[PDB]
Amino acid sequence: MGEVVMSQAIQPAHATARGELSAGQLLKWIDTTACLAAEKHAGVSCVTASVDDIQFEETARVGQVITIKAKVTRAFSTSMEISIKVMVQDMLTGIEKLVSVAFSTFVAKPVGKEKIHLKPVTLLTEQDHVEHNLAAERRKVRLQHEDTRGTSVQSIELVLPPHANHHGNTFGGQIMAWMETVATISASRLCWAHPFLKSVDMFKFRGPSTVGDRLVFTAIVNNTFQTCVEVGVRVEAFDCQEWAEGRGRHINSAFLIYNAADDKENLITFPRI
Amino acid sequence: MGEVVMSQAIQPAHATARGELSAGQLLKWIDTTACLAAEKHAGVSCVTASVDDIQFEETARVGQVITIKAKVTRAFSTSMEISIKVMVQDMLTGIEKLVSVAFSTFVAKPVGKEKIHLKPVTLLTEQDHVEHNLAAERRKVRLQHEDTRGTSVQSIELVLPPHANHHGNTFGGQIMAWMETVATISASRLCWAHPFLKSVDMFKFRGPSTVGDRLVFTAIVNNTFQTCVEVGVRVEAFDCQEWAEGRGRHINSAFLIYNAADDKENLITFPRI
Amino acid sequence: MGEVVMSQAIQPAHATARGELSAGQLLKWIDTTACLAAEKHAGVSCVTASVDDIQFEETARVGQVITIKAKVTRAFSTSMEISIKVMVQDMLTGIEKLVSVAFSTFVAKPVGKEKIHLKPVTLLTEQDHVEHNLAAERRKVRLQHEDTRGTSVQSIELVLPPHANHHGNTFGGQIMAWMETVATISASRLCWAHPFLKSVDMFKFRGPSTVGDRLVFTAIVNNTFQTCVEVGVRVEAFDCQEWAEGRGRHINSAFLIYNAADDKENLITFPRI
Numbered sequence A, B, C: 001m002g003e004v005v006m007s008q009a010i011q012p013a014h015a016t017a018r019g020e021l022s023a024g025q026l027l028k029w030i031d032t033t034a035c036l037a038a039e040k041h042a043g044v045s046c047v048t049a050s051v052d053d054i055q056f057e058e059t060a061r062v063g064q065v066i067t068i069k070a071k072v073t074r075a076f077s078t079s080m081e082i083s084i085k086v087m088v089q090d091m092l093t094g095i096e097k098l099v100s101v102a103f104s105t106f107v108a109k110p111v112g113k114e115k116i117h118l119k120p121v122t123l124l125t126e127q128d129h130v131e132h133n134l135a136a137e138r139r140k141v142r143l144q145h146e147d148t149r150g151t152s153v154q155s156i157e158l159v160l161p162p163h164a165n166h167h168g169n170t171f172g173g174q175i176m177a178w179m180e181t182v183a184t185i186s187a188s189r190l191c192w193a194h195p196f197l198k199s200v201d202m203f204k205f206r207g208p209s210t211v212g213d214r215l216v217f218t219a220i221v222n223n224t225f226q227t228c229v230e231v232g233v234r235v236e237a238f239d240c241q242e243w244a245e246g247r248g249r250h251i252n253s254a255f256l257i258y259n260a261a262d263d264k265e266n267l268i269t270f271p272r273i
């Protein structure tokens, strides 16, 4: 019913040192599902234009099953809004818990110089009309949002073919995964404990990336508050030539909020800064 | 001696939540080895045409070493039959156990409009002639075989470059791996325990897949019997356009038989359906 | 300051059966960082020409963070020398330990028939001049170095797009990773315990490899001495046609020295051979 459904069993390969699902991996999965919904509407390849605020109510563990459902709520001109629901199920108890509810914005790409005009989302249920109207306000918010200490972390990732679509365009989800890895390192470096992602703030993907180009990641704590730490990550891009000349492209800047727990499952308080 | 040998140490990255080798990973490895044997005979790229019945006598664990040997038993016109032997060795005891003995059929692909004629397999030992004759009967069987409850699982995989050969053709082994993941989720969802793969029934790859296209996987228990559960998986393919229009290609349908164990190493009985 | 910095948290996906970082993975990371430094100097794609001796003072564990820093010490004509420093940090204690200090030689590749002339490394500090001079001697040594029992291991790897750069050239680091896997299997097969990499001897990458070609790996113990075992690995390459005809290309031959520990953290002595 307009939904794209992905199901993933959580393996050690998706895990952190604690037997928990890497938040970056989950973000990758989410972006993939959403992108598939978008492309299912568009009929052409789509890329992650932006992401709204994402909060995680639960942290999934190895052995559990993640279910991700994405849907196109509304098409505009070249962009569209995707609603995402993430559920976790324990396979010993049978219990389902909501992990996340979020929105992401995807943009349809032409092959060449094709203009692109998206057909409208067909509406049936009343809730379809409701979400169809809310999509406009949420979009307005998204657009207006573009009104815009030595424990730093630096990292670098080379963009290979499995990190982009078949046209060569880097996945926003991969970037989000790498981002999350680096940020987590920063948080850990502040608390010397075990950080788990509480949320990611809304941000835009400002420019495209391509296979073969370098992504420099710069993470640093921006603020702290009781049990929450905020890490800001910057993603800058260079093709080989740009890499040689030091002139990069600001791909994106995001803010990730973490909690943390020690080597016992008890929560901890971050120092003030 | 016509054999292709692969050796793989089993790491957490190849593991399930139980420290056992993912059956899908093993299937990937098997298909790869077999394909390498086939291409070693053909001199051109080959794809997985079909797979005979595969039974697993053992389940390998993290720390153990898998050895896979493949061989071309007989070439026909464009296809050939590959015999596969899978052994596991424990690296603390030195003990080897047979994991599997199976056959797979591979088809040589031309580059363009080239006709393809395969040279015969050279025969030395008598057992080479024996298997060369048996290959005909086994083939006859393969060809004749094409005479052809709410715990469902749905999943989706985007086919990226590491999932296909350099011409863009999706590996049958990758499809088998994904299949296995989804199916395992279904079985778990029936028993709420820990399923391990007992076997896979013979099936054909009905059509090609290509980088960039979506594979929709649909798993559902078809039957049960004492300690065995049967999960059927369907694999449907869509390029982006087909994805938009809902017209897919039936790539394949397979049937996987599992057992299961609880959080103790004791076997369990599945309910009747 | 001419440095390229990569930071990697160590996950189960990077781990062995013992919760330690795979040496091959570390080698991959090292080669990547170094290559990025090289390309940052050259402005074009670079490949691993050779590697000096690498010794590992520590073995990192899951949960710890690897930091790798690479730098171009000196450019010659088409080649350049890269100095690499590998540090590990425990994220519970905050303690850093040096893992490695090594040198690698990278070669700039033209796109077509372009001649390639590298600009000199700018020198500031005195240590920059010192290393700039030492680079010549170390190079002289590298060039002169090209003056050149049944527990064998054989394995095979198909080179896919994630294993090469965007021009199709296989990464030396991937080859080093595969090498290490196979070698480790050999060592384990000698001691029936848990080998960890002590060092790798300097070796040259004699020829290029390309996406789609097979890498046959042959590992075998060459010698033993008290607590050290030496495993030699050979890497031979075949495109599909070459694969069919049995005429390969000797890509490289390396020698890896291991120690080992039993299922207690106590070191062990290898038998004489």
Ligand SMILES: CC(C)(COP(=O)(O)OP(=O)(O)OC[C@H]1O[C@@H](n2cnc3c(N)ncnc32)[C@H](O)[C@@H]1OP(=O)(O)O)[C@@H](O)C(=O)NCCC(=O)NCCS
Residues within 6 Å of the ligand: A047, A048, A049, A050, A076, A077, A078, A079, A080, A105, A107, A142, A143, A146, A169, A170, A171, A172, A175, A204, A205, A206, A207, A208, A209, A251
């Ligand atoms: C997304 C992108 C195309 C928009 O760029 P732009 O400078 O804002 O140009 P436009 O104003 O014409 O925007 C075009 C569309 O993107 C939408 N858009 C722009 N900013 C947005 C935001 N912050 N949130 C949601 N949608 C946004 C616009 O509404 C417009 O949609 P419409 O045609 O249906 O009206 C461009 O920024 C981009 O290519 N970003 C990177 C996309 C990408 O490749 N991501 C993968 C990871 S690199």
Ligand SMILES: CC(C)(COP(=O)(O)OP(=O)(O)OC[C@H]1O[C@@H](n2cnc3c(N)ncnc32)[C@H](O)[C@@H]1OP(=O)(O)O)[C@@H](O)C(=O)NCCC(=O)NCCS
Residues within 6 Å of the ligand: B047, B048, B049, B050, B076, B077, B078, B079, B080, B105, B107, B142, B143, B146, B169, B170, B171, B172, B175, B204, B205, B206, B207, B208, B209, B251
């Ligand atoms: C395999 C395939 C080429 C055969 O298609 P087809 O409609 O049966 O056409 P053909 O009858 O001419 O079959 C050609 C060859 O495949 C063989 N073949 C067909 N069905 C087979 C089966 N079920 N089992 C074993 N071999 C089979 C035929 O014997 C024939 O071999 P030959 O030339 O040596 O006599 C085609 O079905 C296909 O492309 N499948 C997908 C292959 C693939 O890309 N797999 C990767 C995963 S998508």
Ligand SMILES: CC(C)(COP(=O)(O)OP(=O)(O)OC[C@H]1O[C@@H](n2cnc3c(N)ncnc32)[C@H](O)[C@@H]1OP(=O)(O)O)[C@@H](O)C(=O)NCCC(=O)NCCS
Residues within 6 Å of the ligand: C047, C048, C049, C050, C076, C077, C078, C079, C080, C105, C107, C142, C143, C146, C169, C170, C171, C172, C175, C204, C205, C206, C207, C208, C209, C251
């Ligand atoms: C590296 C390579 C280009 C040199 O080949 P060659 O037969 O020695 O030819 P050359 O003598 O002209 O060497 C060219 C450069 O490589 C350097 N070089 C050669 N052997 C070297 C070695 N053992 N160690 C360090 N540098 C070396 C030379 O000094 C020369 O550098 P310069 O132009 O700045 O003076 C060639 O061997 C090759 O392509 N190897 C594989 C590279 C690769 O693709 N690696 C990825 C894994 S396959």
